[PDB]
Structure 1
Amino acid sequence: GSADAEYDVVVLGGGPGGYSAAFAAADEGLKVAIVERYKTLGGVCLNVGCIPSKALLHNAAVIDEVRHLAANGIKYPEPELDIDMLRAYKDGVVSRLTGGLAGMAKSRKVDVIQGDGQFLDPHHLEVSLTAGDAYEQAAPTGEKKIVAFKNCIIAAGSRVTKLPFIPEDPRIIDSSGALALKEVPGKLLIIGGGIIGLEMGTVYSTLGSRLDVVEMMDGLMQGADRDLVKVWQKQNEYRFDNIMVNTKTVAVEPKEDGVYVTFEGANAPKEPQRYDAVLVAAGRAPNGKLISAEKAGVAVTDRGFIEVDKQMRTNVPHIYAIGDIVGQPMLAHKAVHEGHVAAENCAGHKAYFDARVIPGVAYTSPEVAWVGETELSAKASARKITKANFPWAASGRAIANGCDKPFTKLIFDAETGRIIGGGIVGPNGGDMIGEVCLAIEMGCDAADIGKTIHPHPTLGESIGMAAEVALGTCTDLPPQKK
C-alpha cells in the first residue's frame, strides 16, 4: 500500500515507438501502461521533431516558390513575416496531434503514467513521478510509484548529442531550440551537414538567416547517394556563405557581439567567424544507458543501444526494445513498425521485423528520398547492380512545375534483375519513394514497374519511366543502346 501497479505490458517512452507498441498490445486485449516523463505522447518526433520541422519546412517552401512565379508574370512583394503567428501555427499542428494521442490512450484504456521510469528488477519499474506540461520541461514530484509488468517494451529513444567543447549560451541551440523560433538569426552556424540541420537551415535561410554549415565528413546528407545530394546542393548553394565540409569546429567562444567560432580544415576561414547563433545538429545518442537496464538484466552497448533480435526481444526474454534506442536509422517510421512487432510478441503471436527496406528522406528543397540498395552501399558490398536514372528535364510536369533539375533513380540486382534500391531528388520525393518501396518489398523487376501504367503528366510516372529506361524502352528520351 502506497504506489504499486501491475500490468501485462509497460511501455517505457510514449514516442512513435512506444505509443504504437502500447496501442497495439492494448489492441490485443493486453492491460498496458505508457511511462512517459513529459505530459504529451508522440515523443521527440511529434513534439520537437518530425512534425514542427516539416510544418515549418512547408511554409518556407511556399515562400520560395512565390519568389519563382514572378517570372511567370505572377507578382508578389516580400511577404510580411509574423513569427509570433508562425510559431503558434507550428505549436498548433503539434498540440492538435498531441491532444488526439492523449484522447486515443484514454479510449484504448492505456494508462499514461507521467514519470521518469527506471528498472527496479526484471519485473519492476520504479517510476519517479514528474510534473510539468511542456515537452522537455517536466520536473520530478519527489513522489514515486512501483509498476510491475509481465512484459516491458523499452522505447526510451535517443537525445541530442552534445559536443563537449561547446560552451553554454542562449545562442547555441540544438533542434528543440531552433524549433522554438525565438527569432531569425542574421547569421547562423550549423554544426553537422546531416538532414536535421540542413532541414533547420532551409527554414531559417528562407526566413532570412544567412547560414554557414560545418561537416566533418566529405559531404552533406551523409548516407544518401551523392548524385542526389549534388542536385540538392546545386539548388541551395546560394543559401550558404560557406559550405565548410571535411572541416573541424575547434573553438566556439561566445562574445557580447555574438558567438565566435573557429574551424580547422580546408576552405575553412582561418579567421574565427562570428554568428548571431549556432545550431548544433551533430547527431543523436540513444538512451539505453539511462534507464538502469542493468537492474532488469537487459544488456546495453557502450554506445548506448540495446541490440535486439528480429522479434524486438533483448537478451532478457520478456523484455523488448524498439526505436532509436535499438539502432540506426533513427526514424519515426522504423519505430512504429518495430513497435507493432514487439507488441505482437507480447500478445504471444510470433512476429519478426520482416520488412527488408526502410525509407530515408531529407524533407529539404528539393526533397532527397531513397531506399534499399544505394550505389555506395552496393559499391561497399560490391553488390553488382543496374541503375536506371530518369531525368526530370524530360518530364513535362517537372518542366511545368519548374523542377526539371531533379530525377528518379531505380537500381537493380544485376544478377536477378530485381529492384533493390530507389532514390528520388525533387518535390514530394518522400511522397513517391513508397512505390519503389512496395516494389522492393514485392521483389518487382523493371518489366514489372515499367508495364505499370503510371498517370501523366506527373512526377510519379518517372518511377515507371526509369523502369522503361531499365528496359531500354523509354520513348520520351533518346533511344537506349541503339
Structure 2
Amino acid sequence: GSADAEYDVVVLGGGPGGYSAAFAAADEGLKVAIVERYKTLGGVCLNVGCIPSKALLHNAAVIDEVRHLAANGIKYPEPELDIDMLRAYKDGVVSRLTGGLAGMAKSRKVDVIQGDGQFLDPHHLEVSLTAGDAYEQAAPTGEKKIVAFKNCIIAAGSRVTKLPFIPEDPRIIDSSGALALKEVPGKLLIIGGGIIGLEMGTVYSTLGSRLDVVEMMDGLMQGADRDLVKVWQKQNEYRFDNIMVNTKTVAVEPKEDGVYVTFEGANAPKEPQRYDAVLVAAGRAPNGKLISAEKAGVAVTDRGFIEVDKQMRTNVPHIYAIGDIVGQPMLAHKAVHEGHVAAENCAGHKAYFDARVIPGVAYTSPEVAWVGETELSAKASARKITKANFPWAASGRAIANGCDKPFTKLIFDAETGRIIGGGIVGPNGGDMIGEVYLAIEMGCDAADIGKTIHPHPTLGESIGMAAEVALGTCTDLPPQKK
C-alpha cells in the first residue's frame, strides 16, 4: 500500500516506438502502461523533431517557390514574416497531434504514467513521478510509484550528442532550440553536415540566415549516394558562405558580439569566425545506459544501445527494446515497425522484424530519398550491382515544375537482376521511394517495375522509366547499348 501497479506490458517511453508498441499490445487485449517522463506522447519525433521540422520546411519551400514564379510573370514582393505566428503554427500542428495521441491512449485504456522509469529488478520499474506540461521540461515530484510487468518494452530513444568543448550560451543551440524559432540569426554555424542540421539550415537560410556548415567527414548527408548529394549540394550551394567539409571545429568561444569559432582542416578560414548563433547537429546518443537496465539483467552496449533479436527481445526474455535505443538508422518509421513486432511477441504471437528494407529521407530542397542497397554499401560488401538512373532532365513534369536537375536511380542485383536499392533526389522524393520500397520487399525485377504502367506526366513515373532504362527499353531517352 502506497504506489505499486501490475501490468502485462509496460512500455518505457511514449515515442513513435513506444506508443505504437503500447497501442498494439493494448490492441491484443493486453493490460499495458506507457511510462513517459513528459506529459505529451509522440516522443522526440512528434514534439521536437519529425513534425515541427517538416511543418517549418514546408513553409520555407513555398516561400522559395514564389521566388521562382516571378520568371513565369507571377510577381510577389518579399513576404512579411511573423515568427510569433510562424512559431505558433508549428506548435499548432504538434499539439493537435499530441492532443490526439492522448485521446487515443484514453480510448485504448492504456495508462500513461508521467514519470522517469528506472528498472528495480527484472519485473519492476521504479517510476520517479514527474511534473511539467512542456515536452523536455518535466520535473520530478519527489513522489515514486512501483510498477510491475509480465513484459516490458524498453523504447527510451536517444538524445542530442553534446560536444565536450562547446561552452554553454543561449546562442549555441541543438535542434530543439533551433525548432524554437527564437529569431533568425543573421549568421548561423551548423556543426555536422547530416540531414537534421542541413534540414534546419534550409529553413533558416530561406528565412534569412547565411549559413556555414562544418563536417568532419568527406561530405554532406553522409550515408546517402554522393551522386544524389551532388544534385542537392549543387542547388543549395548558394545558401552557404562556407561548406567546410573534412574540417575540425576546434575553438568555440562566445563573445559579446556573437559566438566566435575556430575550425581546423582545409578551405577552413584560418581566422576564427563569428556567428550570431551555432547549431550543434553533431549526432544523437541512445539512452540504454540511463534506465538502470542492469537492474533488470538487460545488457547494454558501451555505446548505449540495447542489441536485440529479430523478435525485439533483449538478453532478458520478457524484456524487449525498440527504436533508436536498439540501433541505427534512428528513424521514427523504423521504430513504429519494431514497435509492432515486440507488442505481438508480448501477446504470444511469434513476430520477427522481417522487413528487409528501411527508408532514409533528407526532407531538404530537393529531398534526397534512398533505400536498400546503395552504391557505397554495395561497394563496401563488394556486392555486384546494376544501377539504372533516369534523369529528370528528360521528365516533362520536372521540366514543367522546374526540377529537371534531379533523377531517379534503381539499383539491381547483377546476379539475380532483383531490385535491392533505390535513391530519388527531387521534390516528394520521400513520397515516392515507398514504391522502390514495396518493389524491394516483393523481390521485383526491372521487367516487373518497367511493365508497370506509371501515370504521366509525373515525377512518380521515373521509377518505371528507370526500370526500362534497366531493360534498355526507354524511348524517352537516347537508345541504350545501340
Residues 437-457 of structure 1: per-residue CA shift (max 9 Å, x gap): 000000000000000000000
Distance in 2 between the 1:416 and 1:142 partners?
61
Distance in 2 between the 1:36 and 1:269 partners?
45
Using the size of structure 1 for normalisation, the TM-score is 1.00
Which residue is equivalent to 1:371?
371
Unmatched 5+ stretches in structure 2: none
Which residue is equivalent to 1:68?
68
Distance in 2 between the 1:418 and 1:120 partners?
49
Residue 195 (structure 1) shift: 0.1
Which residue is equivalent to 1:388?
388
Distance in 2 between the 1:192 and 1:421 partners?
26
Residue 430 (structure 1) shift: 0.1
Residues 318-354 of structure 1: per-residue CA shift (max 9 Å, x gap): 0000000000000000000000000000000000000
The 3-state SS of whatever aligns with 1:204 is helix
Distance in 2 between the 1:181 and 1:110 partners?
34
Cα RMSD after superposing both structures: 0.2
Which residue is equivalent to 1:473?
473
Residue 191 (structure 1) shift: 0.1
Residue 234 (structure 1) shift: 0.1
Residue 276 (structure 1) shift: 0.2
Residue 205 (structure 1) shift: 0.1
Residue 378 (structure 1) shift: 0.2
Residues 289-329 of structure 1: per-residue CA shift (max 9 Å, x gap): 00000000000000000000000000000000000000000
Residue 14 (structure 1) shift: 0.1
Residue 390 (structure 1) shift: 0.2
Structure 1 vs Structure 2: percent identity of aligned residues?
Answer: 100
Residue 123 (structure 1) shift: 0.2
Which residue is equivalent to 2:407?
407
The 3-state SS of whatever aligns with 2:353 is coil
Residues 50-77 of structure 1: per-residue CA shift (max 9 Å, x gap): 0000000000000000000000000000
Distance in 1 between the 2:421 and 2:128 partners?
46
Distance in 1 between the 2:298 and 2:215 partners?
35
Residues 118-167 of structure 1: per-residue CA shift (max 9 Å, x gap): 00000000000000000000000000000000000000000000000000
Distance in 1 between the 2:329 and 2:114 partners?
28
> Which runs of structure 1 show a deviation greater than 2 angstroms over 4 or more consecutive aligned residues?
none
Distance in 2 between the 1:374 and 1:101 partners?
36
Distance in 1 between the 2:388 and 2:63 partners?
33
Residue 391 (structure 1) shift: 0.2
Distance in 2 between the 1:440 and 1:76 partners?
44
Residues 331-390 of structure 1: per-residue CA shift (max 9 Å, x gap): 000000000000000000000000000000000000000000000000000000000000
Distance in 1 between the 2:385 and 2:147 partners?
52
The 3-state SS of whatever aligns with 1:116 is strand
The 3-state SS of whatever aligns with 1:308 is coil
Distance in 2 between the 1:363 and 1:296 partners?
39
Residue 461 (structure 1) shift: 0.1
Residue 207 (structure 1) shift: 0.1
The 3-state SS of whatever aligns with 1:132 is strand
Distance in 2 between the 1:186 and 1:123 partners?
53
Unmatched 5+ stretches in structure 1: none
Residue 114 (structure 1) shift: 0.1
Which residue is equivalent to 1:234?
234
1:84-95 alignment, distance < 5 Å:
84-95=84-95
Residue 198 (structure 1) shift: 0.1
